[PDB]
From a paper:
Resistance nodulation and cell division (RND) efflux pumps are secondary active antiporters that are ubiquitous across all domains of life. Substrates can enter the PD through several channels and bind to the access pocket (AP) in the L state and the deep binding pocket (DBP) in the T state.
Given the parallels in both the phenotype and the structural characteristics of AcrB V612F and the proteins from the OqxB cluster, we decided to assess the structural characteristics of OqxB as a representative of this cluster. We were able to obtain a detergent-solubilised OqxB crystal structure in the TTO state. Thus, OqxB can also adopt an asymmetric structure next to the previously determined TTT state22 in the presence of a substrate (here: DDM). The O monomer of the TTO structure closely resembles the O state of AcrB and has an open exit channel for substrate extrusion as expected. Further, a comparison of the porter domain of AcrB and OqxB shows that in the T states a shift of the PC2 subdomain towards the PC1 subdomain is observed in OqxB. As these subdomains flank the AP, this results in a smaller AP cleft in OqxB compared to AcrB. Additionally, the channels leading from the TMD to the DBP in OqxB have smaller bottleneck radii and are overall narrower compared to AcrB.
Residue numbers in the entry:
A (entry chain A): 49 to 336
B (entry chain A): 577 to 672
C (entry chain B): 673 to 912
D (entry chain B): 49 to 144
E (entry chain C): 97 to 144
F (entry chain C): 193 to 240
G (entry chain A): 769 to 816
The structure:
């Protein structure tokens, strides 16, 4: 679960507590724990008796969180809360890293999200891939409170401006039914109102001045596409990196699977930008 | 197991930048160590819960294969541990 | 029709071209056109068929937000008029006949037939008067696809074709069309197989071990019955 | 999924992509496709490896969709996404 | 039927209520529909 | 309801007042990113 | 990049480093005036 900007205390009180009240009693459960950090993230681990079906455990747990979601804070459930069974056996950890310094952990982690994550999770034998490093891209609008208050504006006003002015919308069609006679043409209408870049967001209009000039978001805020989480860094050999943890699904050939993921990484080798390479700092299949 | 697990706890209320500095120092300590091929660093990672706390950090020392090493992983552990016990900024450790 | 329900054509190929770089819908349509031409001029397979058509006309309604604030009309009221009048709005449910049905609000048919109709719907400004929205919108014409197709998370276009089992079997027609895909190819755009093709493209072929072990088992039980490692062959060689 | 009044592009970008993002990672999924029509309708087909249990596939897909629902536009949420297993076993077709 | 796997039955009933949710009133779909395997058997009762 | 009406108040008024005055709130922390100069301390903020 | 991401709104780091920074945030009263929040709140050091 996520609760951006929340104290561990109130995450425990208003997110962990009602959840726990819901999941308690789930079939075959041995015990559960809840960790609520100051990064606004709650992680609840439910451990079941050995021999329990992991998929069945997952469906039961999500049933109980589905019952629970009605009493969670609005902003908690607006981000969604994800229930997923854990693959315990790690088969390989890879790292994307930038030896010189062109790329930071943000760029490499999101490149992992965009180019190697999806084409690794569809390999024959994986059970779960995990990303460790920085966070997903997010359009950060860094407000200056003083400049906002100078124009007689409140944080709520700015947020409602961003919400009103960054929306898709469904413009319908020209020549659709009902009609007194058959139409000749069908034409769909596009009325795009979604912003795509930092400059457009900075161009949001907040108010009109006594000047008559348009007060804009970049007048009171710095706009960037930064990270959605500033809570965890990743470095390989003291260079910026992102760590990919690969976990095989039970019944697989760990040696063959590690060879497969290594060869796949070598295939994505052709499409990396320069100053970004990859390593496998740990291979636990060698033992077998 | 071809790797070592080291970490650091910094004073309560510390920032992630201080943990980053300490973690980078122990990483380079591990690199200057023989037989340690890699210093996989995650400042901000708590090894016990694998949650994110601002005053803790983890670093795995990925060891070279034995046929290229000339020290047992326990001896690398003792050497790296003697090296990072010199850090006064916080409480650092390295274990098997 | 097909021999079975759920796989595709008979012998042949199903293929998807996908764009991983953002080349746009026109580039995808040109790719599918050039491909289909290449498949046609290959002697065996005929012209392939697709549902992708990037040349569907449509109208783009851009908004002047500066002129919007100048005229005192809210951006959400403009988008709301567009939405409810032209695209219909879901209001709520009602019960009738013992069932539950949708209530839909939309402009009647003959008030959303022309661009003047788009210009003519009216929303309210901060002065409280009713103002047409055509002054603040710029309706232009553009060409795009309908339906929009995605395959494996990227924009894509389908391509299923007839076969020629008397000319080019699907197994090597597959690598043929792979050579064509490398031929007519922008970087950042590729092909991926689907339906039976995916199977043939990714199968861990096991027949090449079932056939040996089968003949081995036959020869072995024959040897058992014949007390000879040489007599069973006198039967296994008579089948070809 | 239904986005009444939406054109194929807005449906693809604001309904199909988040749903595909939430579905990707479901086990035994061999491929998937999304079709967005001018009628305001999105049909996303996830095909799994042969021998997969269609009921487990359906419940897992529906669970991921349900968790993605909150990031979907309000009227799409209000209309409701539906997950269902597709059957090839046509036995009879009857017309009135 | 006796001898049926209650877990498989639960999952199938759950899938079908999920598919039927869009044909129900919005006020119902909003509140969510629960599907639990259950025997109406009160196995025992503890009194305080 | 007689007293609530005697104060010119409605059931909706009192209900919304209760909604608006018993609520959890998130309040972030001091010394958090992004900073041009690295911070020493990270101090969580609790508003109740 | 073909995916979807959140857009977030927060004070830039250098404006949320101190207690006085919290006390200095301003908002609107019932007569349209911009008032800082420090006058209506108490801010206390604690541990957790
Ligand atoms: C060296 C890597 C492999 C280590 C082996 C893992 C075994 C440890 C016990 C299993 C617990 C793993 O628990 C793992 O917690 C991490 C916390 O970063 C989550 O990982 C997360 O990292 C980043 C940054 O925080 C998030 O933006 C992202 O969404 C998520 O992937 C994983 O989703 C969860 O599975
Ligand atoms: C006189 C009345 C006759 C009524 C006949 C009704 C049967 C008609 C069937 C149409 C053709 C059958 O051919 C079949 O087409 C369907 C629909 O595209 C394809 O189906 C494909 O798309 C559908 C649509 O999402 C997916 O669910 C499916 O997994 C995929 O394979 C099959 O792969 C192909 O085998």
């Amino acid at each position: 679960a996520e609760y951006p900007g929340a104290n561990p205390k109130v995450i425990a009180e208003t997110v962990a507590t009602p959840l726990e009240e819901a999941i308690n009693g789930v079939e075959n459960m041995m015990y559960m724990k809840s960790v609520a950090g100051s990064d606004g993230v709650l992680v609840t681990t439910v451990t079941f008796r050995p021999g329990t079906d992991p998929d069945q455990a997952q469906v039961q747990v999500q049933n109980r969180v589905a019952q629970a979601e009605a009493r969670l804070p609005e902003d908690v459930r607006r981000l969604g809360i994800t229930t997923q069974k854990q693959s315990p056996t790690l088969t390989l950890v890879v790292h994307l890293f930038s030896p010189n310094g062109k790329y930071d952990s943000l760029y490499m982690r999101n490149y992992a999200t965009l180019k190697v994550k999806d084409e690794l999770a569809r390999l024959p034998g994986v059970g779960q891939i995990q990303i460790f490093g920085s966070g997903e891209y997010a359009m950060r609008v860094w407000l200056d409170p003083n400049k906002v208050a100078a124009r007689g504006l409140t944080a709520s006003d700015v947020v409602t401006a961003m919400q009103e002015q960054n929306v898709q919308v469904s413009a319908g069609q020209l020549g659709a039914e009902p009609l007194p006679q058959e139409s000749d043409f069908l034409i769909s209408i596009n009325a795009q109102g979604r912003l795509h870049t930092e400059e457009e967001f900075g161009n949001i209009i907040l108010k009109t001045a006594q000047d008559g000039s348009l007060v804009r978001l970049r007048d009171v805020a710095r706009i960037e596409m930064g990270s959605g989480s500033y809570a965890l860094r990743s470095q390989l050999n003291n260079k910026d990196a992102v760590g990919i943890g690969i976990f095989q699904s039970p019944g697989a050939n760990a040696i063959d699977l590690s060879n497969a993921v290594r060869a796949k990484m070598a295939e994505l080798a052709t499409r990396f930008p320069e100053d970004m390479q990859w390593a496998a700092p740990y291979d636990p299949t060698v033992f077998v | 197991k071809l790797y070592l697990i080291g970490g650091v706890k910094m004073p309560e209320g510390s920032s992630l930048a201080r943990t980053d500095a300490v973690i980078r120092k122990m990483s380079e300590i591990g690199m200057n160590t023989e037989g340690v091929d890699y210093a996989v660093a995650f400042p901000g990672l708590n090894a016990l819960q694998f949650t994110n706390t601002p005053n803790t950090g983890t670093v795995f020392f990925g060891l070279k294969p034995f046929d290229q090493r000339k020290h047992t992983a326990a001896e690398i552990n003792a050497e790296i541990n003697a090296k990072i016990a010199q850090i006064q900024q916080g409480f650092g450790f390295s274990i098997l | 029709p097909p021999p079975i329900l759920g796989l595709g054509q008979g012998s042949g190929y199903s293929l998807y071209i996908q764009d991983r770089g953002g080349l746009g819908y026109g580039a995808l349509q040109s790719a599918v056109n050039a491909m289909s031409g290449a498949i046609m001029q290959t002697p065996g397979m005929h012209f392939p068929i697709s549902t992708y058509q990037a040349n569907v006309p449509q109208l783009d309604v851009q908004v002047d937000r500066d002129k919007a604030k100048a005229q005192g009309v809210s951006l959400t009221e403009l988008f709301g008029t567009l939405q409810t009048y032209l695209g219909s709005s879901y209001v709520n449910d009602f019960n009738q006949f013992g069932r539950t049905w949708r209530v839909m609000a939309q402009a009647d048919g003959p008030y959303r037939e022309s661009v003047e109709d788009i210009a003519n719907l009216r929303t309210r400004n901060n002065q409280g008067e009713m103002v047409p929205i055509g002054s603040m919108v710029n309706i232009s014409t553009t060409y795009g696809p309908d339906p929009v197709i995605r395959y494996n998370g990227y924009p894509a276009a389908d391509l299923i074709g007839d076969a020629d089992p008397r000319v080019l079997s699907s197994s090597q027609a597959m690598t043929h069309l792979e050579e064509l895909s490398k031929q007519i190819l922008p970087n950042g755009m590729n092909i991926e197989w689907t339906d039976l093709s995916f199977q043939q493209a990714t199968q861990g072929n096991t027949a090449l071990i079932v056939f040996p072990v089968a003949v081995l088992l036959a020869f072995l039980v024959l040897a058992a019955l014949y007390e000879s490692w040489t007599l069973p062959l006198a039967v296994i060689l008579i089948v070809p």
